[PDB]
Amino acid sequence: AATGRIVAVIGAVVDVQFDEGLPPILNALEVQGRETRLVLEVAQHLGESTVRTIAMDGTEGLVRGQKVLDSGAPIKIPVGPETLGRIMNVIGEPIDERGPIKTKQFAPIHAEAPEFMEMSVEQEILVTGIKVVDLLAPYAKGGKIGLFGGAGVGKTVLIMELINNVAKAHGGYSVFAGVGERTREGNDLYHEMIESGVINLKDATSKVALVYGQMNEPPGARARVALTGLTVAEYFRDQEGQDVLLFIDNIFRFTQAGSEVSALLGRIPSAVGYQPTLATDMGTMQERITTTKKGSITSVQAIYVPADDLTDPAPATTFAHLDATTVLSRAIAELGIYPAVDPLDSTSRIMDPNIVGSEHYDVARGVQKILQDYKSLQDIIAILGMDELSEEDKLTVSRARKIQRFLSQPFQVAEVFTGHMGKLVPLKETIKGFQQILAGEYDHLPEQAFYMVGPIEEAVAKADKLAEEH
Amino acid sequence: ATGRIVAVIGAVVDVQFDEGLPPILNALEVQGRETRLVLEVAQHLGESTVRTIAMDGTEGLVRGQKVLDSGAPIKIPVGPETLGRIMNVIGEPIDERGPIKTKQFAPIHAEAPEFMEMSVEQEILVTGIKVVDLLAPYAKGGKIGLFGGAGVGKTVLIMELINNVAKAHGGYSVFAGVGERTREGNDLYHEMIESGVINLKDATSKVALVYGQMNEPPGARARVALTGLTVAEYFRDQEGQDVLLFIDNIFRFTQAGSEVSALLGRIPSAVGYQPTLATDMGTMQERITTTKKGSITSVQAIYVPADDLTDPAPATTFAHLDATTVLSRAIAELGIYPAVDPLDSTSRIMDPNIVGSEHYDVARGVQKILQDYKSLQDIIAILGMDELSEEDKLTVSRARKIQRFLSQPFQVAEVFTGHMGKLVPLKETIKGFQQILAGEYDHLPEQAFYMVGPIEEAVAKADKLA
Amino acid sequence: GAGSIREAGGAFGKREQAEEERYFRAQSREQLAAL
Amino acid sequence: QKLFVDKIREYKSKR
Amino acid sequence: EMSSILEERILGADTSVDLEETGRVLSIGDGIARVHGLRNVQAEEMVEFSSGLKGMSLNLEPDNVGVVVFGNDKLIKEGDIVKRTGAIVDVPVGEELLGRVVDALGNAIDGKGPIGSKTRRRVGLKAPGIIPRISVREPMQTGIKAVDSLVPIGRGQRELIIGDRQTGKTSIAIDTIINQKRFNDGSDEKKKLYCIYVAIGQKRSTVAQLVKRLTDADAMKYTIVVSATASDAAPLQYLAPYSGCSMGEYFRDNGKHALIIYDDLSKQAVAYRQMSLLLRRPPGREAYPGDVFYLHSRLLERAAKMNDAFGGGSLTALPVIETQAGDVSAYIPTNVISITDGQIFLETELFYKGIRPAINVGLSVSRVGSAAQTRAMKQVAGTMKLELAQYREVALLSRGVRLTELLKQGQYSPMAIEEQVAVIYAGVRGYLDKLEPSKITKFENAFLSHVVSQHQALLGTIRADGKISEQSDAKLKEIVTNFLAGF
Amino acid sequence: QNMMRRKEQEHMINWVEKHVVQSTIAKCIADLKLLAKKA
Amino acid sequence: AKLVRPPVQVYGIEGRYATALYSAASKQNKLEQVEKELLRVAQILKEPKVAASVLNPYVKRSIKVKSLNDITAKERFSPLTTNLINLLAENGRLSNTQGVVSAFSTMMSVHRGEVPCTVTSASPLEEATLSELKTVLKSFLSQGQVLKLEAKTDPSILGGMIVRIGEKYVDMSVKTKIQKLGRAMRE
Ligand SMILES: Nc1ncnc2c1ncn2[C@@H]1O[C@H](COP(=O)(O)OP(=O)(O)OP(=O)(O)O)[C@@H](O)[C@H]1O
Ligand SMILES: Nc1ncnc2c1ncn2[C@@H]1O[C@H](COP(=O)(O)OP(=O)(O)O)[C@@H](O)[C@H]1O
Ligand SMILES: Nc1ncnc2c1ncn2[C@@H]1O[C@H](COP(=O)(O)OP(=O)(O)O)[C@@H](O)[C@H]1O
Ligand SMILES: [Mg+2]
Ligand SMILES: [Mg+2]
Ligand SMILES: [Mg+2]
């Protein structure tokens, strides 16, 4: 293998000069003579027998002339069933303090996306248990989902609820990739999965692998940890034909770390400061996250929306890479409704009367229509007043507020915030309850009876309790 | 050491020293000029080359001209002889009264006072102005800033403060004109001559003037603030006096720094400003401070570009002041002068333990009623005055009366408004605003509180109009 | 762009919220009586 | 050690 | 003295001279020295200039080294000799710093002699991983009613204080620092919180006033004040937060609990922007460097709550962010909002409406929430939060006005948790819907005086149990009804 | 007292240094011998 | 093929061309004759006629190219020197010729074990103690290295000795000693 020498160190970008045997792009290089392991990923060939690499760890204590050794292949992580229950970092090292991950096969994190002939068109609705995502923007078994939202709207709480429900009702080796999020949340997730039997530290029967690169890692690690998790999921999908789950949180940090190294990589900025290679890098990543004919990868991705923009280049670019987007609004969470899903901005590709039937589709479209007319009537309520509106308009606004409340739901992972019991509602109960609220079958009940309940039965029970107590 | 000019681009002149490279901040003298052209070393470039900044015009500089290193930074004459005189950036008399015969000279580049020299006493300084004394009172020895866009009253307010505080003072005063109209400097000189403050016949002068105006190259406008700083620093340290330092305008310091930074080969920061904006502003502002060796009551006018208070220069200069008097154009359009924004001016001695519970309560009640009126402004503007409750109508009436009462005629405005200048003691201010808040004048019209002194004059004007 | 008066959040949005929810609180405490 | 002795001499001389 | 200036201040001075590896200044300007040589100098290593100055070797370019100067570059000339130190930037850490005012490198600036520090600690260390941490459970008591009730803060949390200029952020931090006095001199050892205050880019007289406020309340015996004021070089204002964070990590790694306030991080971001623009690094949005999010995240990730196998230590961070004209959607504010575990939004509109502290309870968030509260405060604060919400949507309504006037608090008056819960009890249980709001604060002043003068046993039981038991609830009902009769 | 003890002492510390510079080729020989001890 | 790295690395276009020629001659065992030839062409190109001709920016390129080729075939140079001058003439780097020769000369210098050593004193010192200094500083070198001394005098150090050998550097001056002891006496 080749042997190089560091010739420049500027932040997280390291230039290495190879007198012989220039390493191909995307190879991993091991800096020699360090306490821990520092891996450099080749990014550019600068000519003059010099490459420009990105560091996967900190670059403190690096010397010009320090010897670098070419590994001969991209960052190869250990993949297999032995990574189940374990935690690993970007370069595939155990960070749970449980010894080494002893697999028999190693897979590079840089591979090609599946071709066009390896695609699959089958769409089966994935029942979630949450009323709004099941009614308006239903998920597909094998499709990329995506959860948009600003800071403090409930992306992590919603992804924990989804992990709970699906990954426990599942039998297919889920995989969680923590990309540039808080380490406190990583510890909380680890211990919550340990207590609920999903991670079994004894006599391993665990069904979730963990991959964690958090906010304290340099941009290289935060930009390649998503690909490491993706590689673990790709192995579980290909060499076992299993149905795999891939939870990524947060996926915006991948593009953000790319943007953070772009400037030093020697590239003119694009719009909003992003790298000129935002869309094609995001596409190279996201086209491997897909259901092929060999297996399936149901991918739930939390996507940070900077300052509730939703037109920022990173969210606007990731919209096209999804099937059932679930946008979380802040104005809805400030109404006390949770989850904060925006009904007039969430979208699914299986919301088709030939996929979810005519009843589900009609109920969803009626909910969205009445909420839009509610939005339109709010202006008249603003300037005229609620008194002069017709009884037609008053009744439609009442139905709209009641549907708003009924879209909320208590989560089993949000007891600490609300103290209420976690409710999981089947699909038919949701369809029937919204159909009955649309029909007017409960126009005699207070709107506060539908707030934070399960099906409509609990709504009328809460109505009865509020009627007796008041 | 003798160097030779090897580059001239505007105000930035490169010099190449064959031996004895001068340190940074040194003052170099160009040989062969009709007057004195001083270059201030700013960077070392290697190759035995320095990059200076010229304090005067650079026209006529040839590549190869001789430049001698003086061996020290720009040194100005300091002492009690600079009182009643005018000096430029480099400390030369520009009043045609001969040299300044001092015994000591102080470099204009000194280190800021350390942390252990800071004093913490916060006694109030009464100005005679209603809104200032009420809502954002000044402090003896604190740093004061008068923000404001173009043509809102920064200079009128600073001349009013000079009229009220400077001549009624015991110690010394220093006025550093930094990039402003030269005719205003002439007006100030002649006004101080007629007022006996500056005496051309004996040594009883009480103000030292330092002037580098808007007709000066950017180097002079960047260092004349430091010249004024140095004069005031001598009067504080070596005399122990209580000094008054007036700076107008302190924004031109940052603006000239930006103009020269363009050519110094630096990547620009936001709004095209120098990358070293806050650091230069800090190294300048941390010298304008009261220590335990003397006090410096600093009043600085701060221009605001395009009426944007979030511009990097004012947004950076906010954090250096003990009391900010933010002027507004929207208020100045209503004829309310001074145009002080009541809901944007602050002070660190607006503290009940300092000013008294009565004063604090009156100020906070005035501010609360003005904020209520501001919140109502939208509905008032769209749905008319009728749709307010009568409580809201009373709040609006009292708030408009308070707005009119915050206005005041200035003694310096006796030439372009005609009304006599009113100087309102603090007790009259507190009493009048407390009475207006209590509802004791809900029968007088709002135009009766406009441009008056104490509240009795508002009552008299209300009677006169009827 | 309907509902913009409520999306802005100025004076005419806060009063919209107040008007609407006071009306519906009255109607709610009245409907709890009829039950 | 011209500076060992000087710092102890000149201060002793300061006595 | 008369002999104690030579006896060991000279005779013991380590006057040894050794062969050291050096470099040579090619150019120097705006605090960025380009040093030729130093072939073996490490990245981010502290170097030392021939004129006593110090600097950090940031850029390692093939032909030179970009050394940022910790001080004034006026003393540095071309051709000067830059000598290595061999060590990455480190600060002195220990318990001796408690009660001192230091600069970004750990040097005493209060004139009380050297710090008797035995150990040193890097500033750019790595935050603890996933294993050494545990859930944030212990409450960090601020003494402010709105914070301690509606936006509670745990030990190991990162709570952002964000607002415009002159809205009350530094006052929130100072109240939080002063309040820990009751716990620090008490008996229970694991309730002691050693505060740390980092002043970045502030005026020097402001830090003097702040040290005076903290010593008047005798709150300096457990506080470290790191100060990189406006006149200090940009590298010092960039290094101050990491120095303070290492000083707090000392406590966090040794079974103790610390608290660190970065006041503020906008000025650290500005100093880093300057320092990186002068190194010819390409600018990003608003000319900030590309990795400013990393700059703040690797700092706020070190505020952790360790488990018991690591000592059970803690480090709570309270970053401060100033916004321009209430624009919370800016670059650095959104970065730090994405990093932290919640926010405390301050507004000038609420500030001028008499609501002080102007904590917007609608926008204020605490991602840990109830897990960081005592049981009694939780019992009352649940209903208080819900009632305040209900009032905020209809702005009952009189109860909500009573509650908001209850939330108002003076400056430098941090209450105890027992008194806080008693007040919010007397507010939510209905005994105040009879008074007019213009006497609410009067009632609370008199009521607190009466309770602390007469009923120390009830408050002692509150402080001991943590729950408002039915016995305590009944006795408190008695006290409040009798006083309301008296009032 | 502490005020006088401070300034008088810092004046003292200034006296000695501008006095020693006022106040010898054995150093050049001592420097040659001390240089050989580096090895 | 792949280049050979000179013992030192010079940067810029001067360094690029000098490293190029070092790798060129080292591959053919001709470093010394091309060193002589390059110093010779430095003398040639500091000629007033030739310098005013080729450094003139508004003289056409091929004209000075053929002039350089003429003087290069007249001077009976190695094919490496001819190729270097022609390559400098094509790319338009005639202003960088003496920079390139200086970089190549310092490459050959450091190739001959020549380490730059500098000693400083307050006043000029004995030459016998200068020979002692040379012999003692020789001990800091490996065998195969050469002493190239430059004794400058600086009366501001108040006495002592400031030795810098290569990049290692010892400061024995009494000025830095009084500075150190004074900062120790203050703190
Ligand atoms: N809880 C409070 N009650 C009453 N007054 C307060 C309170 N908090 C702050 N103030 C006052 O409002 C002003 C704000 O001062 P403070 O330093 O706390 O805000 P800030 O966020 O640090 O603004 P800046 O740093 O730009 O000066 C101060 O004059 C202070 O006296
Ligand atoms: N289903 C919910 N029920 C109650 N509160 C919730 C719910 N979801 C989110 N929240 C609240 O909103 C906050 C946001 O937490 P988080 O999931 O980390 O959002 P994000 O990661 O997008 O910033 C939570 O701390 C929680 O208090
Ligand atoms: N206190 C005042 N009273 C009356 N008129 C005023 C007052 N302040 C400003 N003005 C008017 O507004 C104009 C602006 O004056 P000036 O102080 O020079 O503004 P600036 O210095 O900010 O450009 C003045 O010509 C004056 O007519
Ligand atoms: Mg999240
Ligand atoms: Mg003006
Ligand atoms: Mg502050």
| Strand pairing class (A39-47; A50-55) | antiparallel
B217 Cβ partners below 8 Å, 6+ apart?
Answer: B11, B54, B55, B56, B57, B58
Q: Which residue in chain E is spatially nearest to G10 when comparing CA positions?
A: E63
CA A41, distance to chain mean position in Å, is 25
Cβ-based neighbour number of residue G21 at 10 Å: 25
Q: DSSP string of G84-129?
A: HHHHHHHHT-STTHHHHHHHHHHHHHHHTTEEEEEEEESS---SHH
Q: Between E265-277 and E292-300, two packed helices, what is the crossing angle to 10 degrees?
A: 140
The alpha helices in chain C, defined as continuous H runs, are 4-8, 11-31
Q: Give the ligand 3 atom nearest the CA of B409.
A: 3
Domain covering B357-464 in this structure, CATH number: 1.10.1140.10
Experimental determination technique: cryo-EM
Q: Which of E278, F24, G143 is nearest to B264 (CA)?
A: E278
Beta strands in chain G (DSSP E): 114-121, 146-153, 162-165, 168-171
Residue positions forming the annotated binding site of E for Mg(2+): 170, 263
Measured between its terminal Cα atoms, the distance across chain B in Å is 81
Q: Please name the residue that has the structure tokens 């990730």.
A: E301
Q: In whole angstroms, give the CA distance from residue E319 to residue E336.
A: 8
3-state secondary structure chain E: CCCCCCCCCCCCCCCCCCCEEEEEEEEEECCEEEEEECCCCECCEEEEECCCCEEEEEEECCCCEEEEECCCHHHCCCCCEEEEEEEECEEEECCCCCCCEECCCCCECCCCCCCCCCEEEECCCCCCCCCCECCCCCEECCCCHHHHHHCCEECCCECEEEECCCCCHHHHHHHHHHHCHHHHCCCCHHHCEEEEEEEECCCHHHHHHHHHHHHHCCCCCCCEEEEECCCCCHHHHHHHHHHHHHHHHHHHCCCCEEEEEEECHHHHHHHHHHHHHCCCCCCCHHHCCCCHHHHHHHHHCCCCEECHHHCCCEEEEEEEEECCCCCCCCHHHHHHHHHCCEEEEECHHHHHCCCCCCECCCCCEECCHHHHCCHHHHHHHHHHHHHHHHHHHCCCCHHHHHHHHHHCCCCCCCCCHHHHHHHHHHHHCCCCCCCCHHHHHHHHHHHHHHHHHHCHHHHHHHHHHCCCCHHHHHHHHHHHHHHHHHC
H-helix or E-strand spanning residue B41:
strand B38-46
Q: Which residue in chain A is spatially nearest to G19 when comparing CA positions?
A: A48
User: Is the peptide bond between E235 and the residue preceding it cis, with omega within 30 degrees of 0?
Assistant: no
Contact between E285 and E298 under an 8 Å Cβ cutoff? The reply is no
Q: Please name the residue that has the structure tokens 């850029």.
A: E59
Between the CA atoms of A292, A295, A300 and A305, what dihedral angle is there, to the nearest 10 degrees? -30
H-helix or E-strand spanning residue B125:
strand B124-125
Q: Which of B65, B105, B57, B58 is nearest to B81 (CA)?
A: B105
Q: DSSP string of A277-310?
A: THHHHHHHHHTSSS-BSS-EEEEEEEEE-GGG-S
| Measured CA angle at E30 (ends E26, E33), to 5 deg | 25
Q: In whole angstroms, give the CA distance from residue E197 to residue E60.
A: 33
Q: In whole angstroms, give the CA distance from residue A425 to residue A414.
A: 16
Q: In whole angstroms, give the CA distance from residue A249 to residue A177.
A: 7
Q: Which of B262, B224, B245, B353 is nearest to B301 (CA)?
A: B245
Range of the domain at E181: 91-376
Q: Which of A307, A80, A106 is nearest to A175 (CA)?
A: A80
E12 Cβ partners below 8 Å, 6+ apart?
Answer: none
Instruction: Please give, rounded to a whole number of angstroms, the shortest distance from the CA of E236 to a CA of chain A.
Output: 18
Q: Look up residue B359 and give its amino acid.
A: H
Q: Is B151 annotated as a binding residue?
A: yes
Architecture of domain B75-347 in CATH?
A: 3-Layer(aba) Sandwich (3.40)
Q: In whole angstroms, give the CA distance from residue A125 to residue A141.
A: 6
Residue positions forming the annotated binding site of E: 166, 168-171, 263, 409, 411
3-state secondary structure A237-273: HHCCCCEEEEEEECCHHHHHHHHHHHHHHCCCCCHHH
User: Is B304 near ligand 3, meaning CB less than 6 Å away?
Assistant: no
Q: In whole angstroms, give the CA distance from residue E193 to residue E454.
A: 29
Q: Is A82 annotated as a binding residue?
A: no
Contact between C5 and A375 under an 8 Å Cβ cutoff? The reply is no
Cβ-based neighbour number of residue A99 at 10 Å: 8
Instruction: DSSP letter for B271, please.
Output: G
Sign of torsion over alpha carbons B362, B364, B365, B366: positive
Q: Which of B135, B197, B211, B145 is nearest to B166 (CA)?
A: B197
Q: Which of E355, E401, E377 is nearest to E463 (CA)?
A: E377
The alpha helices in B82-162, defined as continuous H runs, are 130-135, 154-161
E387 forms beta bridges with none
Pick A76-348's CATH classification: 1.10.3720.10, 3.40.50.300, 3.90.1150.10, 1.10.1660.10.
3.40.50.300
User: Is B76 near ligand 3, meaning CB less than 6 Å away?
Assistant: no
φ, ψ for residue A41 (rounded to 5)?
A: -100, 120
Contact assignment for G170 to F35 by CB distance below 8 Å: yes
- Please list every protein residue whose CB sits less than 6 Å from any atom of ligand 1: B 319, 348, 350-351; E 163, 165-171, 356-357, 409-411
Between the alpha carbon of residue A467 and those of residues A410, A450, A461, A470, C28, the distances in Å are: 22, 13, 10, 5, 10
User: Is B301 near ligand 3, meaning CB less than 6 Å away?
Assistant: no
H-helix or E-strand spanning residue A177:
strand A174-179
Instruction: DSSP letter for B113, please.
Output: P
Q: Which of B166, B386, B132 is nearest to B297 (CA)?
A: B166
Pocket test for ligand 1, best of E147, E148, E171 (most atoms within 8 A of CB): E171
G60 Cβ partners below 8 Å, 6+ apart?
Answer: none
The tokens describing G155, both together, are 């009366």
φ, ψ for residue E400 (rounded to 5)?
A: -65, -40
Q: What is the CATH number of the domain that holds E123?
A: 3.40.50.300
Classify residue B154 as exposed, middle or buried by CB count within 10 Å of its CB (0-12, 13-18, 19+). buried
Pick A358-465's CATH classification: 1.10.1140.10, 2.40.10.10, 3.40.30.10, 3.40.50.2000.
1.10.1140.10
Contact between E384 and E430 under an 8 Å Cβ cutoff? The reply is no
The alpha helices in A388-426, defined as continuous H runs, are 391-407, 415-418
Contacts of C among chains (3+ CB pairs under 8 A)? A, B, E
The tokens describing G35, both together, are 């060193």
Contacts of A among chains (3+ CB pairs under 8 A)? C, E, G
What are the sequence ranges of the domains in chain A?
A: 3-75, 76-348, 358-465
CA of E324 to the centre of ligand 6 (A): 14
Q: What residues of G are in contact with residue A20 (Cβ under 8 Å)?
A: 2
Q: In whole angstroms, give the CA distance from residue E231 to residue G85.
A: 54
The tokens describing A432, both together, are 């029937």
Which candidate in E24, E133, E298, E367 is catalytic? E367
Contact assignment for E22 to G168 by CB distance below 8 Å: yes
Contact between E69 and E49 under an 8 Å Cβ cutoff? The reply is yes
CATH level 3 topology of B2-74: Thrombin, subunit H (2.40.10)
Resolution in A: 2.9
Q: In whole angstroms, give the CA distance from residue B452 to residue C5.
A: 42
Q: Which of E443, E178, E457, E160 is nearest to E319 (CA)?
A: E160
Pick A3-75's CATH classification: 2.40.10.170, 3.40.1180.10, 3.40.190.10, 1.10.3720.10.
2.40.10.170
Instruction: Please give, rounded to a whole number of angstroms, the shortest distance from the CA of G151 to a CA of chain D.
Output: 24
Instruction: DSSP letter for B163, please.
Output: I
Contact between A64 and A4 under an 8 Å Cβ cutoff? The reply is no
Q: Please name the residue that has the structure tokens 């008249």.
A: A380
Between the alpha carbon of residue G175 and those of residues A68, E51, F36, the distances in Å are: 43, 11, 21
Q: Which residue in chain D is spatially nearest to E14 when comparing CA positions?
A: D4
The alpha helices in B337-454, defined as continuous H runs, are 352-355, 357-382, 390-406, 426-438
CA of B153 to the centre of ligand 3 (A): 4
Q: What residues of F are in contact with residue E18 (Cβ under 8 Å)?
A: 38
Q: Which ligand is located closest to the Cα atom of residue E367?
A: 2
User: Is B182 near ligand 3, meaning CB less than 6 Å away?
Assistant: no
